[PDB]
């Protein structure tokens, strides 16, 4: 399994763009690698499929996206086409998919799926979506399992904040959404706060400490 | 790590309803344990203000709820008042929170945070999520960190999947809501469908295979 703050392997894989070796692919960008159990399977062809839906809204913020089965390239390119159907998008899939024919990636990851297996008992994958920073390091992780599927605006959501709180010392609260208040980390001083965050609020609490303290989202 | 299906760790631990062992405190139920980096925290406070928010949806769904961080019982039971006070619902807290301080849970269930240590250099945990079914074993989970809040209502939307495909033979769809058609699960054979799903619908896709397969939910 991986931990957060660790850096992803730097593993070599075949694709739908051939052969490929991560750190290089990745390169200095933010990444989302998300897996599914099977191709030919109908939740995971609504999954990818909203990610093409979506693939706009990751370029947008500089999130590279890969997806990941343990199923081979040719049927990764002719299972490709329904998921384009689905999707109701024309056009070149605009992401790769990579082939884990062995299960390394499965088993490094810690994403092997608790139910699901080959009908010659072969392990698969879970759904699982791993966000990797453009140093390399794993920033946030789910595993959903193969009955479930993802929902891809939380992953947005997720990005919105990784980014956000990678440039300003705030921290995004329950439920926020882009554009809402956030909170300013416990670590700024209320002198350092004057100049940073001169509309700062500091709610009082019964506990009679200072900590709860919002801010309007800094511009990043 | 604690990887899915795995039977979640039968862990002693002291919290602020006392001394419990895990599978003896969840028993014949569904559970959601989740951490937070540190009590008298901000993001941490809205977190458990807001669980507190949704106490009833959950217990609607039979889901018993804890909370853990590395701090000590005292410190849970002070801070509960500003989560109490945040949440704007009066009453006794709905769920414990349990007392990390030797770090031994953070560590064997994968959820140190990347960032947060205390002063005195000890790892934090980050914001976990692990649903539990009522066999002990681990079903879902999140790793979120210090510095991003989570979506309690997915954990809800999630629990409503987990529920609805343990017991029916269909697997809910990017986006699924309660009430959306799901799918059926490629094991059911076309004709257990004519009886199990008889409003099935088989979507036609370029590469001529009969697998997706709609139906409205159960």
Redesign the interface.
Known sequence: ?????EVFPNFEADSTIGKLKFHDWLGNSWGVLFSHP?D????S???L??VIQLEGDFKKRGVKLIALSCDNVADHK??S??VK??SGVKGDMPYPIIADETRELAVKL??????ERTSTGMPLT?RAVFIIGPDK??????????????????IL??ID??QL??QKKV??????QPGDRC??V?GVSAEEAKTLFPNMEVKA???G?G????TPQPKS
């Open positions: 399994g991986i931990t957060l703050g099977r030919f399977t109908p939740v062809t609504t999954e499929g909203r002719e299972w086409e329904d159907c689905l810690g994403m092997v799926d608790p139910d879970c390091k794993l920033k946030l992780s789910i595993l959903y399992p193969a009955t479930t599927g993802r929902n891809f605006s939380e959501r997720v904040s990784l709180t990678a921290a995004t609260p329950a439920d926020w909170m300013v416990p609490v019964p506990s400490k900590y709860l303290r919002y």
